[PDB]
Write a protein that binds this ligand. Structure first.
Ligand SMILES: O=S(=O)(O)c1cc2c(O)c(c1)Cc1cc(S(=O)(=O)O)cc(c1O)Cc1cc(S(=O)(=O)O)cc(c1O)Cc1cc(S(=O)(=O)O)cc(c1O)C2
Ligand SMILES: O=S(=O)(O)c1cc2c(O)c(c1)Cc1cc(S(=O)(=O)O)cc(c1O)Cc1cc(S(=O)(=O)O)cc(c1O)Cc1cc(S(=O)(=O)O)cc(c1O)C2
Ligand SMILES: OC[C@@]1(O)OC[C@@H](O)[C@@H](O)[C@@H]1O
Ligand SMILES: OC[C@@]1(O)OC[C@@H](O)[C@@H](O)[C@@H]1O
Ligand SMILES: OC[C@@]1(O)OC[C@@H](O)[C@@H](O)[C@@H]1O
Ligand SMILES: OC[C@@]1(O)OC[C@@H](O)[C@@H](O)[C@@H]1O
Ligand SMILES: OC[C@@]1(O)OC[C@@H](O)[C@@H](O)[C@@H]1O
Ligand SMILES: OC[C@@]1(O)OC[C@@H](O)[C@@H](O)[C@@H]1O
Lengths: 91, 89, 91
């Protein structure tokens, strides 16, 4: 059968983990911070997902790259919910 | 085509590359002195990976998916164990 | 049709980000260093892509794993152009 496609990132020593799953054109998010998996706020269209994250001090910044067709949309976590980023590409 | 995921740690570095091929995920390893085959071998058509250090100790999480079922595999120094991850796909 | 596939890595606190996109058998690269996205030098064949990177001091090292069929080629950025690495697999 058609397999879902995942992307994962982690930070710190607890750690926090975020796993994004593209399934039937939608990306959803599962989260771990030491005490059970739960569903996160991220829910956006995409057949394909990649993720990277970095710390600035103790503040986490996450970038999720969601692709449908040739269009990749960047989604940004910087402490004020998810926001659409400036990323563009000419695919 | 086959599908891969990669993680690395330290400054040597160590690198681990996971490849999903014909329903199986295998692992190739670099620790500064050449590539060799690792112990990870579990079913999956899709793979992602993340890893983190606790001091000098590496912890690796491999997300192996077949259909809508994703199984998390955990390296914490004592072989690969199944993790608690679930998702409602 | 089938969506493009991406992989992403980041480093430092600016940060720098690199996003690799596999589109109709070719992988290209977009770059962020804090002041706008631009096109990078990576351009190699591939249907599937993953990436990892690490810092040695302030110097970035990037490894891109590009797959076509059962052949995965590692491409290495060590400051001086993209070169084929020693990665092999028996797929
Ligand atoms: O248990 S099995 O994995 O062997 C299985 C095989 C087939 C099946 O029809 C089912 C199970 C029942 C079934 C289960 C589910 S689930 O609830 O998600 O587990 C879903 C379906 C289903 O038929 C519906 C379905 C989904 C997809 S997908 O879009 O790729 O996920 C494909 C199909 C589905 O029927 C077609 C299909 C493909 C395949 S194959 O594995 O690709 O050869 C086997 C069977 C199929 O019905 C034949
Ligand atoms: O991208 S869309 O899903 O909107 C789309 C679907 C179909 C289409 O016919 C077109 C677009 C028009 C079209 C666009 C392009 S493009 O400008 O390059 O994007 C190319 C084609 C095309 O018909 C030609 C074409 C190429 C290929 S490929 O060489 O293998 O990539 C396959 C096909 C093509 O028509 C067959 C095909 C496959 C599919 S599939 O369901 O995605 O497999 C849908 C449609 C198809 O015509 C049916
Ligand atoms: O604590 C969970 C959460 O806030 O963590 C940061 C992001 O992963 C969000 O989508 C998510 O809801
Ligand atoms: O704060 C958001 C932002 O500026 O962060 C850096 C890059 O990810 C940009 O594309 C993005 O718009
Ligand atoms: O041999 C190196 C090894 O022990 O490194 C840690 C994990 O990547 C293991 O699967 C692997 O076998
Ligand atoms: O020690 C294993 C474990 O607790 O590590 C943190 C998460 O990866 C969990 O899903 C996993 O079961
Ligand atoms: O400054 C841009 C650049 O040199 O950054 C390092 C690599 O990502 C290169 O492919 C890219 O062209
Ligand atoms: O200096 C290049 C190199 O040695 O870097 C570490 C690994 O990526 C190797 O496959 C690669 O050939």
């Amino acid at each position: 059968m058609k397999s879902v496609q995942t992307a994962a990132t982690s930070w710190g020593t607890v750690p926090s983990i975020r796993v994004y799953t593209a399934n039937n054109g939608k990306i959803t998010e599962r989260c771990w911070d030491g005490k059970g998996w739960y569903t996160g706020a991220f829910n956006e269209p995409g057949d394909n997902v990649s993720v990277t994250s970095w710390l600035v001090g103790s503040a986490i910044h996450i970038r999720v790259y969601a692709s449908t067709g040739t269009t990749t949309t960047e989604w940004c976590w910087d402490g004020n919910g998810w926001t659409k980023g400036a990323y563009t590409a000419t695919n």
